[PDB]
């Protein structure tokens with residue numbers, strides 16, 4: 001009939017959207033489809049990919065590896081994708097180097113990441129030939145801020161490296177199969193390659209899942225990180241043919257970075273190269289003295305380390321990138337970061353090689369069907385952009401009861417705030433039927449709350465820190481809930497946007513799910529986005545960009561609560577006093593909160 005391959009499995013609520021996304025994508029449009037989390041988007045993605053595939057169209061589905069299992073188990077069973085084929089391209093940028101990442105972990109006191117690497121890089125989240133270990137995505141879960149670019153599995157990492165072996169084994173299975181599953185990072189790396197294993201040079205149909213993340217994947221691909229302690233470690237044992245000049249050039253670079261950071265008004269701002277000319281000598285000489293090192297005789301790892309250092313220095317010298325210094329007075333691990341504030345050329349080079357696309361996420365619209373700022377982040381041409389009506393069923397908000405209690409003190413980052421916020425949080429934790437997730441915006445607030453909250457909650461309380469990551473806190477939260485205690489999670493970062501608080505001991509019983517019963521927003525997440533592209537976007541567009549980004553960081557934070565239909569007795573507290581003030585700048589947020597009733 002008229003139905004697409006796999007529409008029967010697709011949820012009825014998603015059937016209209018699907019159909020729309022089928023037509024425009026066939027036309028050539030880049031479609032913005034937003035359905036609420038828990039609506040069975042994977043079945044829709046499988047149906048779209050199949051409907052494009054049987055026409056002879058080469059189809060690429062770019063999704064995070066953490067949901068690729070669900071996508072393949074939605075795709076494999078339908079006849080059409082079996083007819084055309086379903087392969088999965090695991091390029092090297094999908095894998096970290098265990099040796100260098102362990103090196104980074106011991107230097108940065110990352111106990112959990114080190115333990116993970118020592119255990120074999122086993123997946124944190126449970127067609128696929130071997131078990132996927134050494135994934136960059138899992139390491140990101142264990143360390144939000146790890147320098148992925150200097151830790152990725154390079155092409156010249158030794159053959160005995162477990163990540164290299166696993167990559168080669170997975171490569172031995174890659175066949176051109178019509179439907180190709182890849183990651184966001186792989187997509188961005190391939191686009192960067194083309195702008196200068198691989199995907200088709202032209203993608204007839206591109207389904208991006210969790211598209212709200214794609215931009216980050218591109219940013220990480222155009223980042224470059226110069227880390228000095230491992231570089232010096234490598235140089236000192238490398239040889240004597242050009243060693244001492246390289247060591248002293250690195251020391252000169254370190255001192256110049258120290259001077260530049262000392263002179264800065266604050267260390268967070270990403271200054272351009274012209275703003276800090278002291279680096280121009282050092283970098284250049286560094287580059288030169290990193291080219292004065294003989295290749296033959298070098299260990300397989302030292303080659304990649306030196307080459308990546310040269311790449312980072314050349315990116316910092318190109319003048320097209322914004323730099324960031326972190327040095328000894330503040331940061332023990334000396335780092336020079338270099339990123340692109342404008343990803344327009346690469347994202348264009350992506351969409352120009354795309355016959356049609358469907359971007360799928362639970363958060364693609366600032367308000368209603370407004371995909372303007374998402375369209376700006378992904379640099380979708382306005383000609384091809386097509387926003388479809390969002391799909392947010394009533395079960396996303398009906399179970400949850402919005403609590404009117406709040407902390408009157410404004411979020412001033414002060415102990416005066418902290419004690420009263422802790423008092424209201426204590427009242428919340430007394431009544432919690434299950435887990436409690438207290439979302440904070442800064443580590444300062446997290447540790448401040450932990451100070452005034454640790455005694456009463458005792459073993460319940462779970463702090464998130466640089467030392468204790470979001471994934472480790474998730475594991476502890478689930479384990480504590482299984483044990484009958486009612487944990488409270490002072491979470492931040494990935495807790496806002498990247499954790500699924502669904503009881504997996506209750507898959508077919510959503511009504512009994514109490515893994516997260518009370519979600520508590522301490523304050524509005526204004527200015528949480530730190531991307532270079534966000535700096536540029538805010539500069540160009542004013543405070544509206546800040547308000548919009550904060551609004552959907554807020555939306556994802558609330559999306560922590562309800563994950564599937566059937567849940568009940570969910571409680572939502574938002575303790576930010578500015579919400580209940582009369583200010584107009586909170587009017588978007590109140591709008592969101594107005595969907596939650598009583």
Ligand SMILES: Nc1ncnc2c1ncn2[C@@H]1O[C@H](COP(=O)(O)OP(=O)(O)OP(=O)(O)O)[C@@H](O)[C@H]1O
Pocket residue numbers: 009010011012035036037038039040041042043067070209210
């Ligand atoms: N029509 C349906 N009826 C019942 N269960 C369904 C239906 N469609 C999907 N499901 C199941 O519901 C669960 C939720 O699916 P999924 O995780 O893909 O949802 P999502 O949050 O919308 O999407 P994604 O994780 O891809 O962004 C899955 O186990 C899926 O198999």
